[PDB]
Amino acid sequence: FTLLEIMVVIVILGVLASLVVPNLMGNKEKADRQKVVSDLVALEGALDMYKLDNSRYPTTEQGLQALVSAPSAEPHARNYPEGGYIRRLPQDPWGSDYQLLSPGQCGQVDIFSLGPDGVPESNDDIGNCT
C-alpha cells in the first residue's frame, strides 16, 4: 500500500516511459517544401489564365493580388472573372507573400518569397526557378 503500491509502480512507470519513443521532430519542415512546390505550378498555372484573357501578366506592384481582385493599377484586364483566378491568396507562413516579378528573368514572370529562413533572396528564395 506504501511499498507494493509504489515500488512496483515506480518500475512500471520507468519501464513504460522508457520504451515509448514515438517519432522525430522536423517532419513538418519537409512538408513546407511541397506546400510551396504545390504553389509553384498553382501559381504559374493560375497566372497563365490571366495571361490568356488580358493576354498578359500583372505587374510587380500590381502583385498577385490582381489574381485575387481586379487589377486596379493599369493595364486593365478584360473579362476578368469573379474574384479573379483564385479564391484567396496563399500566405507564406513566415511573414511573406509570393512576390512576383514583372518581367521574369527565367521566363515571362518570376516569383519569390522569404521562405523558412525568413530572409529575402538569400537561400529560401523559392517561388519559381530560383
In contact, 70 and 84? CB cutoff 8 Å: yes
The 104-123 site mask, x for binding Ca ion (CB under 5 A), equals -------------x-x--x-
The 49-78 site mask, x for binding its own copies (CB under 8 A), equals ------------------------------
State how far the Cα of 34 lies from the Cα of 54, in Å rounded to an integer. 30
17 binds its own copies (CB under 8 A): yes
Q: Within 28-47, which residues bind its own copies (CB under 8 A)?
A: 44
Q: Which does 90 bind (CB under 5 to 8 A by kind): Ca ion, its own copies, none?
A: its own copies
In contact, 70 and 80? CB cutoff 8 Å: yes
In contact, 47 and 67? CB cutoff 8 Å: yes
In contact, 68 and 83? CB cutoff 8 Å: yes
Residue with cell 507564406: 92
Binding region for its own copies (CB under 8 A) out of 2-10, 54-62, 109-117, 118-126: 2-10
In contact, 46 and 90? CB cutoff 8 Å: no
The residue ranges that bind its own copies (CB under 8 A) are 1-3, 5-6, 9-10, 12-13, 15-19, 21, 23-24, 26-27, 44, 81-83, 85-88, 90-91, 93, 107-108, 129
